Design a protein around this ligand. Structure first.
Ligand SMILES: Nc1nc2c(ncn2[C@@H]2O[C@H](COP(=O)(O)OP(=O)(O)O)[C@@H](O)[C@H]2O)c(=O)[nH]1
Lengths: 285, 336, 336
């Protein structure tokens, strides 16, 4: 699972050192850097085995609740029955193989309110208060003796979308525990280039392609307060779409520019269309 | 680079918004004056009582309060853990209007250049409103309240709050604030002046009728009936009486404060307003140029192209009542 | 925020000063263009020869050169150490006009944003003028040369030098310079435009006579015969012909570049110019509004108050000759 990751090798090692220590990482950054992909591959790195079972991924939304996450009382035909969630069940597998590393992926964690979801468990999931000693009876626990303890093997990864203007303030509960990590777009990198060079891409088109995007990313990142640095465009669109072996060229490029990036500029630039028209022309013209 | 004494400016703002002793305050700068009004203004409200607007709340509680929503209750199975999804009406002061006050005060406290006593009193009140929630204010927040359900009094302080927010700039520190140099810019000062008179004249000149009059050019063009290309022309104010009609165009110019050449470029607008405007009554047509000066007031009359035109000034910085006296004297002479 | 292509701007400046292929230069920004003219412009002079003005020099030398001043010689006793106080005429190129060129070039080299080749050539010339003395330039230096003894050619580059000096701002470094964003400001751009036409029309419209006409108001005031308070009114240009007279008022507005509401506030001046102006000949009276646009040109006619008025535009950025074609077409139609 480490053959072609466009991100520099430095950060992906930094995370692995950070992850084994803090155990609760946040990967920020614009959409289209494969936050799911890098994290999904990173999960295999920490295990070292390209095995899916230890890894699970869930997408948070505002209505995501403790009931789905951990424990709930769904009805059967006649009467209500306690139903284990994802995380609760997930840990039961991890307890079997404490030697091995089990990993939980949480996409778009910022959107939901974590507190209602984790509830009691939010204390435990931090690296320090782990093991049998910190075990607690659950909210729905009929008997106090049954307890839940976060094993050390667990490593939790969170993905947060920087792009939204709608964002105002990061949740406090998130900040106290997790180690925030910012993912640069990395549009100008060797592995992305050499991947493109291995595919039917001439260097001029590469240099043309890399040159224009950097100037665009700098422009938006430059006006930091009006628009965050995380608004700057990613690279993931250019990766996919070449599965058929199509040559990447200005003919192919112009569709992705106009189809995918153009509305993104429209949302980012809702003030001046001439300013939009200025940058769209330079990409191809 | 002379400017108006700051205390006098507050009076024209009052007429602009259409709703006192300021000798007490010793801070000449505006924000000291303006805060004292707001800080005292809130206190006037609290004595009578602040606005309490019933906010309906739909939340999950362990019992019946108000009206139960059967659907969300069964779908969430809240009966099982002894809870209901119920709608009820908590009574708060947390409305948009009142939230603006506290959030506005935060900036007021944060302002770097301010009287300490004023900041002391404001910080007290900031604490005295615990329930209300702080906000990061925008004009859209003020925009939503243009409906104006609130009392006549509330709209006054909010109008004050609008002036502060728009005229607030961060200063030496990232958090702290520094007040805008409002007087130095002519356009807003002029736009104040143009609006000042329109609302003022309604108060005092009950004898006359005061209207802003839209005009259509006398032109016809074979190209377009629209005449969109032509400038939009809307009088600053028109003050019509049965015996005589009269138009005023007033603007603030920096050159005029120097007592030399004279800046009357706005006059060029005036004749064309007189021309396209045609009275059915045919009583009379008159025009006035009025400007603000500091030292003295001088009044002239003109008979140019069959039109009766006046140039006049007022010595702002003299005294507000004598200033009020002067204006009534001014309009009376020319109107006659 | 669209602006004119920079190459076209140079042409109007030329007419403004009243005295070519720029395809060669690849630097679109103005200072690249402007320097290439100056750097090449000096070279044109040197081929014919630069101005040499006899500066009389009174100095102490060991012998007779020119005219001896007997008094300073005896009073200083310079005869004893074999010297005389003598007046003679060294021939230099060190005049104010030529000194300005070298001093101007220093700023040109110091400019941070500039073509390297241009800077290379300029640094060569800077060395090639050793005798001439560097200076710290002021407008008063240019002021002293308004007498204009120099040739018609010298006045061109100096006019260029004036533009650079006034439009020079220090940039990133204390020493280095950075060019002014001339196009963005409307007032100077408009003042260019107003002056551009006046000198232009004299060239091409030899058929008509071109004059700026001062006017006196038709008003009389019992207060003052002077009417100093009234605005000074001087036409931008008047282009009189025996069959018809015609006044033009042209200004640069930012709003008009957007193709909506239209900014024609200057029009208010126009009618009053028509009114106070009275022709003895009584051939006709006409007015024109002309503005610069980027994309396209649109022409309209109006018959408002017994006056014949046109609104028209030019698509600057098209091409200078076709632009030159368009203007001659424009004035011809309306003039007729
Ligand atoms: N090979 C490779 N694929 C990438 C890289 N970055 C993104 N991708 C791919 O881009 C596609 C979209 O990724 P993702 O961000 O998860 O989609 P999203 O849900 O819209 O954010 C997936 O195929 C990613 O694996 C990369 O650096 N290398």
């Amino acid at each position: 699972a480490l053959n072609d990751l466009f991100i520099p090798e430095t950060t992906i090692e930094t995370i692995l050192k950070r992850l084994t220590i803090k155990k609760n990482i946040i990967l920020q950054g614009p959409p289209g850097v494969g936050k799911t992909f890098v994290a999904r591959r990173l999960a295999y790195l920490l295990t070292g085995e390209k095995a899916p079972q230890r890894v699970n991924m869930v997408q948070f939304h505002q209505s995501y609740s403790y009931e789905d996450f951990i424990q709930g009382y769904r009805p059967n035909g006649v009467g209500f029955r306690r139903k284990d969630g994802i995380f609760y069940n997930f840990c039961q597998q991890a307890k079997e193989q404490p030697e091995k590393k089990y990993i939980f992926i949480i996409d778009e964690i910022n959107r939901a309110n974590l507190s209602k979801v984790f509830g009691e468990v939010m204390m435990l999931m931090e690296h320090d208060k782990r093991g049998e000693n910190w075990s607690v009876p659950l909210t729905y626990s009929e008997n106090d003796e049954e307890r839940f303890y976060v094993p050390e093997n667990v490593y939790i990864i969170g993905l947060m979308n920087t792009a939204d203007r709608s964002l105002a303030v990061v949740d406090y509960a998130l900040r106290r525990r997790f180690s925030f990590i910012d993912i640069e777009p990395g549009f100008d990198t060797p592995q992305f280039r050499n991947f493109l060079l291995n595919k039917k891409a001439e260097p001029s088109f590469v240099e043309s392609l890399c040159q224009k995007m950097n100037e665009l990313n700098q422009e938006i990142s430059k006006e930091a307060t009006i628009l965050g640095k995380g608004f700057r465009i990613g690279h993931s669109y250019f990766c996919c779409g070449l599965e058929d072996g199509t040559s990447p060229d200005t003919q192919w490029l112009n569709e992705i520019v106009m189809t995918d990036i153009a509305p993104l500029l429209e949302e980012y630039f809702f003030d001046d269309p001439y300013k939009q028209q200025k940058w769209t022309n330079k990409l191809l013209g | 680079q002379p400017v108006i004494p700051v205390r006098n400016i507050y009076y024209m703002l009052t007429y602009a918004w259409g709703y006192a002793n300021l000798e007490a305050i010793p801070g000449n700068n505006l924000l000291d004056i303006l805060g004292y009004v707001l800080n005292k203004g809130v206190l006037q409200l609290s004595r009578r009582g602040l606005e309490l607007d019933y906010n309906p709340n739909t939340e999950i509680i362990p019992g019946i309060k108000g009206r139960i929503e059967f659907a969300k209750t069964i779908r969430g199975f809240h009966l099982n853990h002894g809870k209901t999804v119920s709608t009820f009406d908590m009574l708060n002061e947390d409305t948009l209007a009142n939230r603006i006050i506290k959030s506005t005060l935060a900036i007021l406290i944060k302002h770097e250049k301010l009287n300490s006593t004023i900041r002391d009193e404001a910080r007290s009140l900031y604490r005295k409103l615990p329930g209300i929630s702080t906000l990061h204010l925008t004009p859209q927040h003020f925009s939503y309240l243009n409906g104006g359900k609130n009392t006549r009094y509330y709209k006054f302080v909010i109008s004050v709050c609008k002036f502060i927010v728009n005229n607030s700039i961060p200063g030496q520190n990232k958090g702290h604030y520094r007040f805008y140099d409002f007087e130095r810019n002519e356009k807003e000062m002029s736009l104040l002046y143009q609006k000042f008179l329109y609302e003022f004249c309604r108060r005092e000149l009950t004898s006359a009728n005061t209207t802003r009059s839209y005009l259509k050019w006398d032109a016809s063009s074979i190209s377009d009936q629209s005449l969109n290309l032509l400038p939009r022309m809307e009088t600053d104010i028109t003050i019509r009486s049965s015996e005589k009609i009269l138009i005023v165009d007033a603007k603030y110019y920096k050159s005029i404060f120097s007592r030399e050449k004279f800046h009357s470029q706005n006059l060029y607008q005036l004749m064309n307003y007189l021309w396209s405007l045609k009275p059915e009554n045919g009583e009379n047509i008159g025009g006035l140029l009025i400007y603000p000066h500091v030292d003295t007031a001088v009044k002239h009359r003109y008979k140019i192209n069959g039109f009766d035109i006046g140039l006049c000034t007022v010595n702002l910085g003299q005294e507000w009542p004598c200033i009020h006296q002067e204006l009534l004297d001014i309009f009376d002479e020319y109107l006659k």
